[PDB]
Amino acid sequence: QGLMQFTLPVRLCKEIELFHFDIGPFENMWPGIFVYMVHRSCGTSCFELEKLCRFIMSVKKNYRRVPYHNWKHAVTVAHCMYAILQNNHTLFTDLERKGLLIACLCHDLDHRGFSNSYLQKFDHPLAALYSTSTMEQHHFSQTVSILQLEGHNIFSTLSSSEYEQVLEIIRKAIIATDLALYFGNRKQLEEMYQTGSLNLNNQSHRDRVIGLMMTACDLCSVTKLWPVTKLTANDIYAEFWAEGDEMKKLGIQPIPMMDRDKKDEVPQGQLGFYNAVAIPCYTTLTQILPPTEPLLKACRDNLSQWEKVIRGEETA
Numbered sequence: 559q560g561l562m563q564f565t566l567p568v569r570l571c572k573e574i575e576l577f578h579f580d581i582g583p584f585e586n587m588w589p590g591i592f593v594y595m596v597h598r599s600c601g602t603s604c605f606e607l608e609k610l611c612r613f614i615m616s617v618k619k620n621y622r623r624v625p626y627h628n629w630k631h632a633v634t635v636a637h638c639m640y641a642i643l644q645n646n647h648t649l650f651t652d653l654e655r656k657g658l659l660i661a662c663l664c665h666d667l668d669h670r671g672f673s674n675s676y677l678q679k680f681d682h683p684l685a686a687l688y689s690t691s692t693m694e695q696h697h698f699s700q701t702v703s704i705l706q707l708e709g710h711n712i713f714s715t716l717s718s719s720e721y722e723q724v725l726e727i728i729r730k731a732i733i734a735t736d737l738a739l740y741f742g743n744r745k746q747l748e749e750m751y752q753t754g755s756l757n758l759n760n761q762s763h764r765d766r767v768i769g770l771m772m773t774a775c776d777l778c779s780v781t782k783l784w785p786v787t788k789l790t791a792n793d794i795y796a797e798f799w800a801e802g803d804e805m806k807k808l809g810i811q812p813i814p815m816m817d818r819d820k821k822d823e824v825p826q827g828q829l830g831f832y833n834a835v836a837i838p839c840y841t842t843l844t845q846i847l848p849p850t851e852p853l854l855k856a857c858r859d860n861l862s863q864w865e866k867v868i869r870g871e872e873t874a
């Protein structure tokens with residue numbers, strides 16, 4: 559029955575193993591790419607193919623047509639997680655491999671392209687339901703809904719308690735994509751690394767490490783080849799500037815990164831974001847998971863490209 563194996567064209571088969579892989583513009587290939595990544599990083603026995611495929615198409619349908627936080631982002635974040643898991647295969651359990659690829663696919667479900675801040679200022683009903691990590695708690699609740707549709711329980715062969723464990727892996731992974739939580743989590747991990755107290759057999763330490771892997775996967779567009787990184791930056795700002803428009807309509811001055819009038823400062827903004835967020839992220843992750851080195855190196859390469867843009871040597 560494991561006689562039906564998923565295969566990719568030669569170029570994709572080789573390049574999908576590299577951290578900087580780009581899943582391409584053919585969206586009808588992204589489910590196949592995802593299944594392939596599950597079969598190889600988990601095993602062909604991890605899920606029944608018919609439920610997985612039905613689950614994947616329900617997740618796709620509950621992603622929206624927004625510039626950045628869309629289906630392509632979900633698969634892209636999932637692929638970064640595949641590359642981390644394939645280069646660190648000894649360190650993770652069967653449940654974690656299983657749960658972390660799904661958490662990445664589902665992590666921005668039903669994203670409308672607005673920050674937790676905008677939901678709070680707009681007084682969106684979701685803000686009353688969840689006061690912190692508003693969108694992330696909605697993404698997880700959307701994941702549970704889909705898992706609960708008929709013929710969608712991809713975890714049907716797990717015991718009650720294993721099912722509960724993997725849903726807890728998934729819940730914490732999706733919550734950890736709230737960038738507001740990342741600053742505390744990374745400082746804690748850094749302290750624990752440099753004191754030498756960090757212990758991957760400690761469940762609350764695993765939680766923190768997985769959280770950091772989630773942030774690294776979520777930001778992974780800063781770890782692509784420069785043309786990908788630069789084009790993706792247009793999609794991110796298209797959402798930021800629409801949100802800033804929406805802030806102005808509420809009579810609220812938007813923070814600078816969401817103001818389309820500060821367009822010419824995008825190169826300085828990116829430089830800001832690389833030094834304050836991205837570099838520290840991939841540094842701490844490489845310290846803990848040495849084989850994730852190419853993420854840091856490609857980030858450093860793109861930081862150097864943004865500096866190049868600031869000094870007029872490149873155009874954007």
Ligand SMILES: Cc1nc2ccccc2nc1-c1cc2nc(N3CC[C@@H](F)C3)cc(NC3CCOCC3)n2n1
Pocket residue numbers: 776777779780794813814815816817820821823824825826827828830831834835
């Ligand atoms: C938040 C994000 N998330 C990304 C995720 C993936 C890829 C790029 C991503 N870039 C950004 C990003 C983009 C950006 N542009 C800025 N500008 C532009 C022109 C001037 F107004 C300033 C300023 C910032 N400061 C950050 C620093 C960390 O605290 C929050 C704000 N950021 N941050």
Ligand SMILES: [Mg+2]
Pocket residue numbers: 665666693735736
């Ligand atoms: Mg998110």
Ligand SMILES: [Zn+2]
Pocket residue numbers: 631635665666735776
């Ligand atoms: Zn995301």
